[PDB]
Structure 1
Amino acid sequence: AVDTAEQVYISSLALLKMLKHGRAGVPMEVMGLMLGEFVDDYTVRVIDVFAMPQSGTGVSVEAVDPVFQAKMLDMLKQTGRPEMVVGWYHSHPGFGCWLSGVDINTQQSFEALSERAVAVVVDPIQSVKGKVVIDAFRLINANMMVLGHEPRQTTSNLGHLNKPSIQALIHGLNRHYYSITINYRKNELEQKMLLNLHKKSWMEGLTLQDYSEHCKHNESVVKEMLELAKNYNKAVEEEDKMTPEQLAIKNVGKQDPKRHLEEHVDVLMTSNIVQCLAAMLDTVVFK
C-alpha cells in the first residue's frame, strides 16, 4: 500500500558523509545507519548519518553490531537531537546502484523492526562532478508477486520520471525491490557557506606574480607561435581540398595549428591584461 511518491529527502550534509565514507573504503562495501525522521505517509527525510565500523577483511555488509548502534545513538542524543534509524547505506565501488542477494537479506532485517525502512546505495567512483548517483531502494514482498498484483499503487506521475538503469534492471529492479525518488534540501545558509567558501582567496588579487618570471613566460609562449605560425601557412594551402571528411580524419595524428595557436593566444592576452591591470590598481591603492 505504498504511495509511489515517497521522495526521500536526504540532506545537504548527510550526502557528504555518505560519499566520504564510500570513497574511504572504495574496494569494500562499507555500511552505516541513516538517522532521519518520518514526516508524512508520503515522504521520508534523513538528517544525519553515522558510519559503522568495518568487521575486517571482506567486501561485504554481512551484519550490523547491536552494541555499537546503541552506544553512538545513546551518545548523539545527549548532545544533538534524538533521531530514529530510518535506513542503512552501503557504497558500491563501481558496480552501479542495486541490491545484491546479501544486501536484500540484510534489508528485510531492518524492515522487520521498522515497516518503512529505506535502503540507500551510494556510488563514490561513478559520481563525477554534478551527478552523485544514489538511487535509494526498498524491497517488494514476495507474496505480491505470488499474488501477481502490481505493488506501489501509482496515483501520480511523479515516480516515473527517472528511467531505470539497464544495469540495475538486470538485477532485482521492479522484481525484488523498487526504487524511490531521491531529492535534496538546500538552503542559502548552507549554500552561501559552501559555494562562497570553496574556491576563494584573501589577498592574491594585488600580487604581481614574479614580474621577472612573467616576461620569461611570455618569451617562451611567443617563441612557440613563431614555429606554430609557420606551420599555419603549411596548414592552409593543403586544406580546402576534396572530401573534407578525409581532411577531417587527416587531423587525427598531427597537431593542428588552427587550435594550438588560438590556445596560446588566449592565455597570453589574459595573463598580461590581469598582470598589467594589477600594476595600475596597486599604484593607486598604496600611496
Structure 2
Amino acid sequence: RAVAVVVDPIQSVKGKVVIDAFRLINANMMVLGHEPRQTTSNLGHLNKPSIQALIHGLNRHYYSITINYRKNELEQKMLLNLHKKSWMEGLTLQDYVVKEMLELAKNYNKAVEEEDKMTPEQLAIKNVGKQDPKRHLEEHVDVLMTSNIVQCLAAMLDTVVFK
C-alpha cells in the first residue's frame, strides 16, 4: 500500500484528527475508471465532508482513506483509569480559592445583573413591533448554582473531615 501520513502539529488540544493518509493510483490505469472501490458505500461513508479543497484539487490520482481510532481492551480502560482517577482530586482525597471567590463571584454576578434587568424597561406589546429579544438569566442561574453549592459543601468540609 505504502500509505502516507500528513500532519500539522499546531491545531488543537483535544479535538482535531489532523492526520491525513493517501494512496496514489498510477497514471497507467488512465484507460480504466478511477477509484472503483468495489462497494463505494463505506467509501461514500468516508466521502462525508469532501475535506481539504486543495487536496480535492489534488483529486488527480488521490483520495483519503478511512482511519478509525480503534479500541485497545488491554489499554483503553487503564488509560481511562489514568485520566479520570488521576484527575479526580489526583489521589481522590485532596480538596474534599473559597473565601475570595465570594467577592469575585459577587462582582461577576451583580455587574452583569443590572444590565440583565435593564431590558424590562423596553419590553412592551405590539408583538413584532419591538426587536431585541435576548435572554438574561445566563451565568446567574448556573454560575451561582455551582458556586454557592460547592462552597456550602466547602462549609460542610469541616463536619465531613472533622467527625
Once the two structures are superposed, residues 157-210 of structure 1 have per-residue CA deviations (whole angstroms, 9 ceiling, x without a partner) of 445433353534655544222222111222344333333433666895999999
- 1:125–1:187 distance in 2 versus 1, CA, 3 Å: same
Please name the residue that 2:28 is paired with: 143
Displacement after TM superposition at 1:248 (Å):
14
Given the superposition, is the C-alpha separation of residues 167 and 262 from structure 1 closer, same or farther in structure 2, using an over 3 Å criterion?
Answer: closer
1:130–1:273 Cα change, 3 Å: same
49, 61, 68: which one aligns with 1:176: 61
Counterparts of 1:165 and 1:222 in 2: how far apart (Å)? 50
Q: 1:239 to 1:138 in 2, by over 3 A?
A: same
More helix by share: 1
For the structure 1 residues 253 and 232, does the alpha-carbon distance in structure 2 shift closer, same or farther, using more than 3 Å as the test? farther
Distance 1:129 1:240, change over 3 A: closer
Q: 1:282 to 1:205 in 2, by over 3 A?
A: farther
Q: 1:282 to 1:245 in 2, by over 3 A?
A: closer
Contact 2:22 2:65 in 1 (8 A): yes
Q: Does residue 112 of structure 2 align to residue 236 of structure 1?
A: yes
What's the CA shift string for 1:24-78, capped at 9, x where partnerless? xxxxxxxxxxxxxxxxxxxxxxxxxxxxxxxxxxxxxxxxxxxxxxxxxxxxxxx
Aligned-residue offset at 1:244:
14
Corresponding residue of 2:123: 247
Q: 1: CA distance between counterparts of 2:47 and 2:121?
A: 38
State the distance in 2 between where 1:148 and 1:207 align: 60
Once residues 126 and 93 of structure 2 are traced to their aligned partners in structure 1, the CA distance between those partners, rounded to angstroms, is 43
**5+ long unaligned stretches in structure 1:** 1-115, 212-220
Which of residues 101, 117, 133 in structure 2 aligns to 1:257? 133
Query: Structure 2 CA distance, aligned partners of 1:120 and 1:201?
Result: 32
CA contact (8 A) 2:109 2:140 kept: no
Q: Is the 8 A contact 1:138 1:178 kept in 2?
A: yes
Q: Post-superposition shift, 1:252?
A: 18
Match of 2:47 in 1: 162
For structure 2, list consecutive stretches of 5 or more residues without a partner in the other structure.
Answer: none
How far apart in 2 are the matches of 1:255 and 1:223? 42
Cα 1:152–1:141 change in 2 (3 A) is farther
Return the alpha-carbon distance in structure 2 between the equivalents of residues 272 and 232 of structure 1: 14
- Per-residue deviation, residues 80-119 of structure 1 (Å, max 9, x unmatched): xxxxxxxxxxxxxxxxxxxxxxxxxxxxxxxxxxxx2111
Of structures 1 and 2, the one with the larger relative CO (CA 8 A, separation 6+) is 1
TM-score (norm 2): 0.53
CA gap of 1:235–1:169, structure 2 versus 1, over 3 A, is: same
Contact 2:46 2:65 in 1 (8 A): no
For 1:25-40, what aligned pairs fall within 5 Å after superposition? none
In 2, the alpha carbon distance for the partners of 1:261 and 1:251 equals: 22
Q: What residue number does 1:130 align with?
A: 15
Q: CA deviation at 1:136?
A: 1.3
1:152, distance to aligned residue in structure 2 (A): 4.0
Looking at structure 2, the residues matched to 238 and 202 of structure 1 have their Cα atoms a distance apart, in angstroms, of 37
